[PDB]
Write a protein that binds this DNA or RNA. Structure first.
Lengths: 525, 119, 181, 51, 51, 135, 189, 221, 399
RNA sequence: GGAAGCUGGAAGACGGAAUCGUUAUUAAGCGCCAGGUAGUCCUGGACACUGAAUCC
RNA sequence: UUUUUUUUUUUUUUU
RNA sequence: CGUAGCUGUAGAUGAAUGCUAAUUAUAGAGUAU
RNA sequence: UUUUUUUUUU
């Protein structure tokens, strides 16, 4: 439709919009609450204080919201994941009444609850899991495919739940088996589903045989940007045979089909982030394309910052060296890029590379550092990048600022370790002590200790630390040193997990007194 | 011209529900509670089980069943001839709503607990 | 607090069965005024309340087929008065009751008011410098018009609520409810 | 008036409810209220149990 | 439980709901400040004034 | 007649169960009542107006009925309260005792023949209402 | 009158001297007469001002050939009063009861009101019956017609100066409202 | 600011440029512009306003000044450290001249007369954002400092006397931007502000009391 | 034509109008044309301002297809039906496929047939044939030339219900059948986890096979391979069975492909929701007194869905309600499908337009004598309403 | 004793003849309640709207 | 009132 | 408020309303077909 | 003399 919106320009710059829609929310009808909530979703700036006010009042006004209204309100929470400890009590108070045998709510309710904090066993998991396993005879083809992405992100699953969806696809796919009817309908519903279940290290005998291509002469399956699903599914424990019929294909070995600048480089790069795959001898050809692509001015300020951030991990797969291509050959006059939208993406990239430089040969092995001159050049880039963010700090959303803290605290370790010039003002005013809306973590249901939980401010924005269990529980080659100071397996993909885990342990020791911490809690890839 | 409810479209015989969207007159209230007697009896936990035969769906449509429903419904709208002027009958939904909510009778639309209201 | 109360208003009503008796009360009440200590005496407002009437019917001499009728009219009179800011209770209550004459009853209606937290704020205003870088009529109430408007609105609100609630609880055979037995 | 009530549960509740309503009703005299309930507890006790 | 949701989770297990118990509090206060009459069988005699 | 009685049994409006010394509701309120200690202490903390009709006239051989009414009025807007507490105030009393034009609530109590007896009753129930509203 | 309202309004536009109090009053006259039955058949106004004018047919076609610069005034007219102060100034309680009629002792009706009616020539006192004032379109009816003219003057490849008036009308906030789904369509074009 | 259809230098052209920046920052569809453009635009008028005759009634009133300051308070763009724009406006002649040209109750009428005929400011609309912007300016914190204190105190004393008949939404903003670290000390003492704070809370108890300084308090934004 | 020409009457040929509108005149115009004594006189229609705003939108919509243009229907609320007499004939002259239906209620308050089915939607074999027969009178020469897609072959049931929605009615019957047959495998612990999961796996295998053998939908086997959409003559031949299946097939076909602009106009849309004159045993105690709701039938339901206008990639729908068949009352527009930004609320005729209407009747020799002195006097009497103006002047001599 | 559902083939289109009277918000129609101290009338009392004609 | 309504009238009262 | 205006049915040769296996309400009691 | 709504239709 033709979207249109009018601003309150009665007096042409009178009053304050953020303040105007602050007091009225305290005393308003239930219908007006939903209308005002949508305003912040599409707003530019975000006020952490206003977010808590709406959450607190939602629980009190939950006695007049219709079931459809609750789902619509919960849908708006998808973006900028934010929640409060009082929000869970409101949704749990009406979820049981919403169980009217819904066909589509099985996916919408589950997808919305995936983020924030859920999986509460004796409030939410018991009715949802009991009603989803017995309603497997009416799931649509589109819904089944989407459910694969949901179960993949879960933690600590159960055999009855995993097996329910495994057998659903076998019978559903058989009906379509007996060029657009198979090339985009049959193969699409096979590799997409296999990857979802493969995350939970689960597989049956009556799924692998059917999922794999029975005929080895079945060429022209998927393009370069879809064949990675089959490769990612295998290479887990003992999986093989799916990769290529005899390691000799016609569209996935000779530089794929065709790689060019015609809106193809970004698509392949984006697919490599959510798929746990290492660039082998054949997959390393993508890095070479960056050298020529970066030369063009259009590509230098349209997709350059996005590609660098989205593929910073696995340094020996995108960049020839950590400082060579990460320098500023011609960025002196081209540093600015849409105020802050792309400028902040460069800051995070420079932080992750720093961790790899130190943790290379100082007790981690797996490589070696470069000449000392590399560090000198790297510092020349960060010094002139943080200053531009000072006047543009207010133009960042809640999600943008949340990830900034993780990359900001990293620079406060190497500098003082025994440097950055703007490390005593910008890094010690707001970047060190942030008070943005802290979302709840994603905890499992294996411990069964939900009756004694708390919250402590730290790097992961909230945690589980109660007064009764305070400082008391949650607080060979790959276990001795990798399970100690590192505490991160090279499943998932560690470059990001190691940085987040190490910072959490330090933040909980500097301020709070929390000893004998058992990290564990490694989510699937 | 000869509309039901008068100029102000009065409605002193219908009851609204907080959940879903469904309304019915007091005439159907008697039949609903009698039909859903198994759920009410089991909720609490022979002389007590006296109205069991009335739960039949076909018996209500017979001659005997028609008289039973009319006996309980006293037609509150009808009264004495002297009840004229200010002494006019009011909406009897106040008493019906209390019994319908206390008995915990499920709604035909959606199975829910006491959610009825005056309207 | 009892000491914090004050008589906001005092509606004084009369009910006389004769025209002459009602006229005598008006003259007596006026004479009691213009004699208090304050410069202006309390001057209440007038508010007539119509004149209800009743007249039963009877057949008319016995042993007749109802060819003629004789009626007996029984008229009545009413009068209401309003008061505002009754500072002196002795000079108002005594005057109203002392103005009666004959079979002329009365029905007063007191109205008190309690004050909450006394607003005490706005101290001596700050100040800085640039850095160089009567009218009282004869027969009228002395009270302010703003006070009467604030009190008058309250009276109209209570009357509407009482009529609505009274109509609800008005049915023949009190204590009878449908399908109660 | 509430000093002794019928032993039977059915009769105890029937008479008990009347006490709460009579005390909050206009039209009955103070003397009549006492006598109304005093004679009610006796007639109920002189009858077979409600079971 | 956490910190603030301590009483909400506990009430859920006991069977409390945000719609049923809400009306119980209103009725509890209403019955105290008003009469106890609820259409019980036999209360029609106490409402009629004495003649 | 028997059929109508059986109907009230199913809905649960009968005293049928599948000495005692109880406490009457009136006596319970008397026990729980914070009274003032002398005239100089403010019991309530909000404005309120008390109205009552007093009959005066010549010596009548008989008493005039309908001369013992007592009611209290207060404005909800002046009374500062939270959003949740404000809604409960109008729900307990209902919309009949609330005016949508000015925004005032009138509470009338008349269950006694005597004026003095009725006047004291109003003051007891008024305090109890505020105890439950703030929750 | 209709024959003098347009002349006053036109003079102000040339001199750029408008009035927020006088503009609304003169806008009603230009609307009532425009839709009058005698619009096309009626001849010119007798002031000689219309003799040396491009348009003719009295007010019928005179307003149809009105410059687009002056057309935006009707659409973009401020109808706010002086009491409007709840946006920039601060709190302000508006009154809604000017008249406060209170009786006295010297002008009180006598007790015997039956004879009072018999001492009058005709009925004077009557039940309380007062008629309120209902606001008409207040010039909004004419403004809607003018808004459609700007829509047609977009795809004609006109001058930039003439096109500025179209945006002003489409950017209204108190007259056009959002009745019809034409605002986004005109803006997109 | 009513620029609508030059004496010495930079008097009329400044108004035109002032409104142009606010128009581009008003958009609510995407990013207004680039950060580099803002610095170039800001520096364009930075030196131009310096030579604006450091007089007469031809002085930039607070009415038009507040229109520019309002846009920067909603687009998420922080104003630059440059303060030369604040040293050529308001305090310079818009206050001293007002007092030069011709009891407790007398103080209230003094400030009230300002917005009577000439209307140098839009009551609590334009000056309302002036206090908020001066608070947040130097957003980070472990002569600009001296001038900020003088400006905040001067505008605060002109609103306190009439801080009883204002809109509740406007009162919150004024009170909010006083109990902050950036605000000068010895302003919240038991003179006019300590007892006046509880007055607003009593009228609107539904608002947060303990967390008064949470919107734009010691945390800046 | 333009803003300058507002409130004028456009002459129309008597013979040309009949061909353009084979069904009949739009609205109650048939009552006003019979009053003219002359048989060779033309027909005139006033050009109201409401038509100018609507006509401009259609012009831009056609040029785009060769997100700026509107992609939803409108609604006329409040002379709402008067514009239909001028908007339909004009569109048809511009090579537009217009669906004409001024009297859609004729298929709900007349003699017909109803046959209950499991889908819960009553069909009308007698009225189903008249829908296509009347539509092809003027819309011919275009349907045959239009091709037919292959992605929407035969997925409709006999009553026009979709296969997915029709099979859901039998879910309850099949649920009990499988529960009783599970005893064979239930009666043959092992880890207490795998034993229960294996038993549940049997239900999925049996359910998949049960949902594809018991149900035997009719995939229009009479026409194996169609070539066009107008070549379906078998629908007119058989009426007992193949009457509603073909009706819905054409409706779905005119959403997917886009070759020509389409338009649908449904008049008197306020009488489709209320109850019909039919009698059945589907009443909810006392909601209908044993009557079939009008919206529960086949034909009325097809023209009682405004939220589906988004699927119309070719054109859009439009409706208007001005008659007094039922009191509008509140007439909630939010709980019906239309939005508050798509309602055109017309007003009474202006004094300028009123004068033209009176003068128009004079040329037709309708009135005897209408002096100009009383021209404005009659404006206040009838209030300028069209219904009150024609009736008042007809009864009396006029003027 | 009053009212209501269902059922319905109680007795009547006779006589333009004749006897009871209306001084126009008259006559002719239609609708409401106040009292008769539980219910309990087609009469009496009492209010309001449409409201024509003639030689009276 | 071109983001306004969505419609018959009574026997005491705006003192 | 009733005959409304307006507007669907049959532009009634067939609209008469009493008779009664059966219930509604007041009352201490108005019951039997 | 009689209107839709808490959602499972390409």
């Amino acid at each position: 439709f033709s979207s249109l919106r009018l601003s309150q320009k009665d007096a042409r710059g009178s009053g304050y919009l953020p303040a105007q829609r602050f007091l009225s929310l305290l005393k308003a009808s239930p219908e007006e609450y939903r209308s005002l909530l949508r305003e912040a979703t599409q707003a530019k700036i975000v006020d952490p204080a206003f977010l808590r006010v709406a959450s607190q009042r939602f629980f009190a006004l939950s006695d007049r919201f219709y079931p459809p209204e609750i789902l619509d309100i919960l849908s708006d929470f998808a973006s900028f994941p934010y929640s409060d400890e009082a929000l869970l009590a409101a949704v749990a108070g009406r979820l049981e009444d919403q169980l009217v045998e819904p066909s589509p709510k099985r996916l919408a309710a589950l997808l919305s609850l995936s983020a924030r904090l859920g999986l509460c066993h004796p409030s939410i998991r018991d009715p949802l899991t009991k009603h989803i396993e017995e309603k497997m005879y009416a799931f649509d083809a589109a819904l089944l495919d989407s459910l694969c992405r949901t179960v993949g992100s879960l933690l600590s699953p159960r055999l009855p739940l995993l097996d329910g969806l495994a057998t659903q696809a076998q019978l559903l796919a058989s009906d379509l088996r007996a060029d657009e009817v198979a090339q985009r309908r049959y193969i699409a519903l096979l590799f997409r589903c296999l990857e979802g279940l493969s995350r939970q290290r689960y597989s049956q005998s009556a799924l692998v045989d059917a999922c794999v291509a029975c005929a080895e002469q079945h060429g022209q399956a998927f393009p370069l940007h879809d064949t990675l699903r089959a490769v990612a599914a295998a290479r887990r424990l003992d999986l093989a045979g799916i990769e290529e019929p005899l390691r000799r294909s016609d569209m996935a070995d000779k530089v794929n089909r065709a790689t060019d600048r015609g809106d193809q480089l970004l698509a392949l790069l984006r697919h490599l982030d959510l798929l746990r795959l290492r660039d082998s001898q054949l997959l390393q050809k993508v890095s070479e394309a960056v050298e020529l692509h970066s030369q063009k001015a259009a590509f230098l300020a349209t997709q350059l910052p996005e590609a660098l951030l989205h593929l910073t991990r696995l340094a020996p797969a995108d960049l020839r060296l950590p400082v060579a291509l990460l320098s500023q050959p011609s960025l002196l006059a081209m540093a600015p890029r849409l105020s802050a939208a792309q400028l902040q993406q460069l800051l995070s990239a420079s932080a992750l590379v720093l961790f790899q430089h130190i943790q290379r040969r100082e007790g981690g092995q797996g490589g070696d550092p470069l000449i000392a001159r590399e560090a000198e050049a790297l510092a020349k880039t960060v010094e002139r990048f943080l200053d531009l963010l000072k006047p543009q700090f207010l133009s960042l959303n809640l999600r943008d600022r949340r990830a900034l803290k993780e990359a900001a605290s990293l620079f406060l370790v190497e500098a003082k370790g025994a440097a950055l010039a703007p490390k005593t003002v910008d890094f010690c005013c707001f970047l060190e002590e942030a008070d943005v809306a802290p979302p709840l973590p994603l905890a499992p249901s294996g411990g069964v200790d939900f009756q004694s939980v708390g919250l402590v401010e730290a790097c992961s924005r909230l945690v589980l630390c109660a007064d009764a269990r305070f400082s008391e529980t949650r607080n060979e080659t790959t276990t001795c040193k990798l399970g100690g100071v590192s505490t991160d397996l090279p499943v998932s993909i560690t470059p990001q997990a190691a940085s987040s885990l190490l910072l959490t342990q330090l933040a909980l020791i500097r301020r709070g007194i929390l000893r004998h911490e058992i990290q564990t809690c490694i989510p699937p890839p | 011209a000869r509309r039901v409810g008068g100029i102000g479209r009065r409605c002193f015989l219908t009851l609204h529900c907080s959940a879903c969207s469904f309304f019915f007159q007091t005439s159907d209230a008697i039949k609903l509670i009698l039909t859903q007697q198994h759920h009410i009896l089991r909720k609490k936990g022979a002389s007590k089980f006296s109205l069991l035969p009335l739960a039949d769906a076909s018996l209500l449509l017979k001659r005997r069943g028609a008289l039973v429903l009319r006996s309980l419904h006293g037609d509150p709208l009808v009264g004495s001839r002297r009840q004229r002027g200010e002494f006019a009958p009011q909406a009897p939904t106040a008493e019906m709503a209390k019994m319908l909510n206390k008995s915990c009778v499920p709604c035909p639309r959606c199975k829910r607990e006491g959610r009825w209201e005056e309207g | 607090a009892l000491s914090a109360y004050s008589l906001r208003s005092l509606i004084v009503t009369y009910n006389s069965r004769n025209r002459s008796s009602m006229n005598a009360t008006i003259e007596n009440l006026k004479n009691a005024l213009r004699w208090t200590s304050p410069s202006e005496s309390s001057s209440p407002s007038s508010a007539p309340s119509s004149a209800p009437s009743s007249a039963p019917s009877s057949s008319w001499s016995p042993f007749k087929y109802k060819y003629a009728l004789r009626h007996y009219v029984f008229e009545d009179h009413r009068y209401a008065f309003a008061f505002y800011d009754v500072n002196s209770v002795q000079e108002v209550v005594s005057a109203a009751l002392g103005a009666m004459a004959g079979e002329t009853c009365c029905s007063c209606r007191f109205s008190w008011r309690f004050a909450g937290r006394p607003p005490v704020s706005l101290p001596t205003p700050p100040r800085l410098v640039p850095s160089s870088r009567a009218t009282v009529l004869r027969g009228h109430c002395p009270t302010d018009k703003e006070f009467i408007r604030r009190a008058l609105e309250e009276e109209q609100a209570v009357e509407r609520i009482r009529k609505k609630l009274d109509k609800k609880q008005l049915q023949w055979f009190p204590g009878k409810t449908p399908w109660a037995p | 008036v509430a000093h002794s009530l019928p032993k039977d549960l059915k009769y105890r509740e029937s008479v008990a409810h009347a006490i709460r309503v009579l005390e909050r009703s206009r039209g009955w005299d103070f003397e009549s209220k006492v006598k109304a309930v005093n004679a009610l507890v006796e007639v109920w006790n002189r009858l077979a149990p409600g079971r | 439980m956490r910190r603030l949701a301590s009483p909400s989770l506990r009430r859920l297990q006991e069977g409390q709901t945000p719609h049923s118990m809400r009306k119980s509090a209103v009725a509890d206060a209403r019955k105290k400040i008003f009469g106890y009459a609820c259409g019980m069988p036999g209360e029609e005699q106490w409402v009629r004034p004495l003649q | 007649y028997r059929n109508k009685y059986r109907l009230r049994r199913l809905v649960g409006m009968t005293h049928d169960i599948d000495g005692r010394t109880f406490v009457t509701p009136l006596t319970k309120l008397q026990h729980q009542a914070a009274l003032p200690r002398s005239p100089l202490h403010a019991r309530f903390d909000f404005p309120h107006t008390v109205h009552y009709d007093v009959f005066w006239g010549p010596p009548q051989v008989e008493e005039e009925p309908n001369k013992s009414g007592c009611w209290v009025s207060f404005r909800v807007a002046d009374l500062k309260l939270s959003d949740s507490q404000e809604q409960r105030l109008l729900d307990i009393l209902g919309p009949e005792r609330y005016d949508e034009q000015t925004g005032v609530v009138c509470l009338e109590a008349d269950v006694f023949p005597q004026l003095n007896h009725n006047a004291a009753y109003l003051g007891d129930i008024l305090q109890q209402l505020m105890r439950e509203v703030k929750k | 009158d209709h024959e003098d309202s347009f002349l006053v309004f036109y003079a102000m536009c040339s001199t750029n001297r408008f009035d927020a109090v006088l503009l609304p009053a003169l806008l009603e006259r230009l609307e009532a007469s425009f839709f009058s039955s005698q619009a096309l058949s009626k001849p010119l106004f007798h002031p000689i001002f219309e003799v040396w004018d491009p348009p003719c047919e009295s007010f019928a076609a005179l307003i149809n050939v009105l410059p687009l610069s002056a057309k935006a005034v009707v659409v973009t007219a401020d109808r706010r009063s002086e009491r409007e102060r709840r946006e920039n100034e601060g709190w302000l309680a508006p009154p809604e009861a000017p008249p406060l009629v209170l009786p006295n002792w010297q002008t009180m009706h006598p007790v015997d009101m039956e004879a009072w009616e018999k001492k009058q020539r005709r009925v004077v006192r009557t039940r309380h019956v007062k008629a309120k004032i209902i606001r008409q379109a207040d010039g909004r009816k004419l403004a809607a017609t003018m808004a459609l003219h700007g829509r047609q003057a977009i795809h004609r490849d006109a001058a930039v100066s003439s096109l500025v008036s179209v945006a002003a009308m489409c950017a209204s906030n108190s007259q056009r409202a959002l009745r019809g789904e034409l605002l986004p369509e005109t803006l997109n074009l | 600011g009513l620029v609508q259809s030059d004496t010495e230098s930079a008097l009329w052209e400044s108004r035109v440029l002032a409104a142009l920046l606010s128009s581009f920052l008003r958009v609510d569809d995407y990013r207004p512009s680039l950060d580099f453009v803002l610095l170039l635009s800001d520096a364009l008028r930075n030196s131009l306003r310096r030579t604006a005759v450091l007089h007469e009634k031809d002085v930039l009133s607070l009415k038009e000044t507040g229109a520019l300051l309002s846009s920067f308070a909603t687009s998420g763009y922080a104003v630059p450290p440059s303060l030369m724009a604040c040293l050529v406006e308001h305090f310079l002649y818009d206050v001293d001249l007002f007092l030069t040209s011709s009891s407790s109750s007398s103080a209230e009428e003094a400030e009230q007369l300002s917005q009577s005929f000439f209307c140098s400011s839009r009551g609590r609309a334009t000056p309302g954002d002036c206090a908020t912007l001066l608070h947040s300016l130097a957003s980070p914190s472990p002569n600009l400092e001296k001038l900020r204190f003088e400006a905040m105190t001067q505008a605060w004393r002109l609103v306190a006397p009439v801080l009883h008949l204002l809109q509740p939404p406007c009162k919150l903003l004024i009170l909010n931007s006083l109990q902050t670290a950036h605000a000068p000390p010895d302003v919240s003492s038991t003179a006019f502000f300590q007892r006046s704070l509880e007055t607003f809370l009593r009228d609107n108890p539904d608002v947060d009391s303990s967390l008064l300084g949470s919107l734009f308090g010691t945390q800046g934004r | 034509v333009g803003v300058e020409d507002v409130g004028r009457f456009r002459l129309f040929d008597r013979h040309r109008l009949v061909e353009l509108l084979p069904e009949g005149l739009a609205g109650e115009l048939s009552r006003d044309v019979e009053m003219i004594p002359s048989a060779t006189s033309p027909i005139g229609v006033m050009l109201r301002k409401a038509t100018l705003e609507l006509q401009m939108q259609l012009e831009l919509f056609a040029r785009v297809h060769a997100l700026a243009a509107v992609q939803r229907g409108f609604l006329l609320d409040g002379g709402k039906s008067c514009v239909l007499n001028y908007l339909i004939p004009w569109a048809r002259e511009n090579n537009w496929l217009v669906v004409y239906e001024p009297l859609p209620s004729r298929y709900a308050r007349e003699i017909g047939d109803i046959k209950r089915s499991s889908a819960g939607v009553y069909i009308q074999s007698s009225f189903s044939q008249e829908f296509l027969e009347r539509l092809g009178r003027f819309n011919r020469r275009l349907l045959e030339e239009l091709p037919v897609a292959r992605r929407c072959y035969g997925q409709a049931a006999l009553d026009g219900v979709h296969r997915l929605y029709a099979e859901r009615s039998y879910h309850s019957l099949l649920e009990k059948a499988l529960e009783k047959d599970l005893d064979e495998i239930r009666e043959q612990l092992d880890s207490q986890l795998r034993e229960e999961i294996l038993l549940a796996r049997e239900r999925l295998a049996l359910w998949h096979t049960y949902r594809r053998e018991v149900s035997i939908p009719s995939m229009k086997s009479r026409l194996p391979n169609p070539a066009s959409v107008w070549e379906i003559a078998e629908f007119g031949l058989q009426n007992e069975a193949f009457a509603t299946q073909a009706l819905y097939e054409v409706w779905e076909q005119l959403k997917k492909q886009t070759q020509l602009n389409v338009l649908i106009a449904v008049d008197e849309w306020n009488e489709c929701f209320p109850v019909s004159e039919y009698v059945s045993m589907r009443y909810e105690g006392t909601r209908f007194n044993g009557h079939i709701p009008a919206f529960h039938l086949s034909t009325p339901r097809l023209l009682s869905r405004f939220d589906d206008a988004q699927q119309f990639q070719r054109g859009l729908k439009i409706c208007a309600t001005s008659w007094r068949r039922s009191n509008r009352r509140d007439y909630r527009p939010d709980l019906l499908g239309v939005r508050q930004e798509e309602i055109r609320t017309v007003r009474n005729f202006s004094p300028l337009e009123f004068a033209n209407f009176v003068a128009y009747y004079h040329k037709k020799k309708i009135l005897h004598e209408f002096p100009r002195e009383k021209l404005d006097y009659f404006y206040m009497l009838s209030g300028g309403n069209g219904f009150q103006a024609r009736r008042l002047l007809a009864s009396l001599y006029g003027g």
